[PDB]
Amino acid sequence: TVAYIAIGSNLASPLEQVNAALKALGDIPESHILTVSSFYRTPPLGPQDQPDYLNAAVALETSLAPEELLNHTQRIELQQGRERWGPRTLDLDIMLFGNEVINTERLTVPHYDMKNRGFMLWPLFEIAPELVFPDGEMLRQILHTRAFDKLNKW
């Protein structure tokens, strides 16, 4: 199954942190990275004084069950990270999990708010321009409809 994961960090210098998380995702059991988006520099969603964020998307091939993958992402955030409107040492959000629709106490997929977040959508559109959501919405359509500003690379 292909899962798409969003990564964000707003350490003043987040590259080492993001590469650590990326290595950790690749080391997840029964899983491997297919593709990584470019690294993007985004203005803080939240108070405007804190450091710019680095966002990216990852396509992860996995044989894990959805809640198992989440167990790993929470673990990586704990091991590599350390709140509300930022700063964020390290977030890993499961955006999509194959074509699965999940609505449980722990996990909502597609991610509940990505349709509103250009820092999530644009990196994803870089690696999966043809992506169709489980309900038939098109990633391309969402970006066309909303006209989110394009992002500068890191």
> How far is the C-alpha of 141 from the C-alpha of 153, rounded, in Å?
23
**Closest separation between CB of residue 135 and ligand J1C, Å?**
15
Q: Interacting stretch for ligand J1C, rule CB under 6 A, among 25-33, 57-65, 105-113, 136-144?
A: 105-113
- What's the CA dihedral at 82, 84, 39, 81 to 10 degrees? 10
Grouping H, G, I as helix, E, B as strand and the rest as coil, residue 88 is: coil
Q: Is the peptide bond before 87 cis (omega within 30 degrees of 0)?
A: yes
Nearer to ligand J1C, 72 or 88 (CB): 88
Task: Assess whether 93 carries a catalytic annotation.
Answer: yes
44 scored as a contact of ligand J1C (CB under 6 A)? yes
Continuous segment of H or E residues that includes residue 33:
strand 31-36
134 scored as a contact of ligand J1C (CB under 6 A)? no
Binding residues for ligand J1C, rule: CB under 6 A, are 8, 42, 44-46, 53, 55, 85-86, 88, 91, 93-94, 106-109, 111, 119
